[PDB]
């Protein structure tokens, strides 16, 4: 697949690692590709490849770090926002950075 | 045996996979066929097999995505609705759609 | 061992499957043969093989779906009912069904 | 090492098993020898080996069904009673039953 | 290394065994290196070794019978006393009991 | 990685031993080198490398030592302090100890 990159930052990524999944209701939509440290903030900053076909995603959209089940592995839920449609489409493009995060 | 298709629509599948078992009351009586995300609602939709021996299931009838005890497989559990037969008999035949589902819960 | 056949009707069987223990206070007295769900009242009924020495069994005992520990086996738990002297022997034989189940 | 036996009756023993450990302050005198139910009462009876060189525990001891941490498994705990010097000295025997038992 | 002898008495040892590290602040200083169930008394007795640079701890040390996360293996805790030393400067040594014990959960 | 040591005083280290991870937020940014147990104070001390990138964090840091998930090993978390601007700027460097510790927590 071709795969689009997104950006977010936390407060702790807990146990997420490089090739975790980004899920959208439960279903495959990418992977994490890279954490790293932001230099500025010591906020860690995950780089995501989500694949093309999934593309009319709002800005509005949130990033939750969640385990699946009890002794699971982590993995990125994507909660698809509310967009007010007096206010366009803002919409999630390759290098766009989802401002919607909770953490550990 | 031969079998009929229903739909779903959840908020979120969690752990449910293809092949993932369909119950009522614990035994089997399907298996979830398909899952896709739809690219225009974000929804996950699934596509059920259910064995044609179990066909008077009301539409009132739901669909909750479980776990086997703490650590096992999400599997859908199908609860058996009630429709009054004195006020009209609505009843899931191939090709329909189970409007109401509940969805993975999570931590939380 | 010779056994005997019960049957039992539940909600919900869990995730008792066929060679499931019966137990009466954790000591196995039998199985689970089969398990069916009935397409006329969407029931589960169970068939039960217990061993032929435990055979004064009364009529009023009960079935419990229980779990052996947090992470463990579902079972199935005979709670031996009370035997009123003043109305005689009411005893479980070949073909009976336990009316009393709790499920889930 | 030779042993001597005692009985004892619980409602339910749970995950208990014959060559299950019994333990004073969790070191071990002991192994169930036998589980079996009793056809006169239907509740589960165990036969208990304990250590010869164990051999002045008074009658007023108890069992109970404990588990060896959360995912452990079960083992039987010899609780060593009070007995008044003023009403004798009664001692565990061979073939002598515990009569204060705790279950589950 | 060298080490010293160290007693204590508890009423229940849970899962405890030969071989089992005593710790301080989470640090290994010593090993089980004996139980014996008194036949007498029925209390377990535990024999540990210290090893001997671990030396000025005082008489109202207590030891606790603690498990290392939920699914772990039994330990001792050897908690580190306060003694006034006006009061008397009484510190453990070769043959000594430890009197202050908490027993297994 | 070219690596520098800070130090580290706890009441009690726990689960904690040599190669331990050191993470801010969950990524990991050195490891535990050493851990001994001062004879004179009872206190053990722990040496941390960590990694030379990671090269402005605040004397005001603080270090935890937390589990990963339920079941998980011990690793320390290194929360990065404040630096005040106005009086100006206290870095850690190769040898400085990390003043600000909390202890494995215990049963209760
Ligand atoms: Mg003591």
Same mark, same amino acid.
């Given at each position: 697949?071709?795969?689009?990159?997104?950006?977010?930052?936390?407060?702790?990524?807990?146990?997420? +690692?490089?090739?975790?999944?980004?899920? @959208?209701?439960?279903?495959?939509?990418?992977?994490?590709?890279? @954490?790293?440290?932001?230099?500025?903030?010591?906020?860690?900053?995950?780089?995501?490849?989500?694949?093309?076909?999934? =593309?009319?995603?709002?800005?509005?959209?949130?990033?939750?770090?969640?385990?699946?089940?009890?002794?699971?592995?982590?993995?990125?839920?994507? =909660?698809?926002?509310?967009?007010?449609?007096?206010?366009?489409?803002? @919409?999630? +493009?390759?290098?766009?950075?989802?401002?919607?995060?909770?953490?550990?």
């Amino acid at each position: 697949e071709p795969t689009y990159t997104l950006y977010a930052t936390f407060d702790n990524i807990g146990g997420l +690692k490089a090739r975790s999944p980004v899920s @959208i209701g439960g279903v495959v939509v990418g992977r994490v590709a890279d @954490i790293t440290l932001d230099p500025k903030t010591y906020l860690p900053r995950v780089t995501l490849e989500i694949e093309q076909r999934y =593309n009319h995603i709002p800005d509005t959209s949130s990033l939750s770090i969640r385990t699946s089940g009890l002794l699971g592995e982590q993995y990125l839920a994507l =909660n698809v926002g509310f967009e007010d449609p007096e206010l366009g489409t803002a @919409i999630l +493009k390759d290098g766009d950075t989802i401002q919607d995060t909770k953490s550990a």
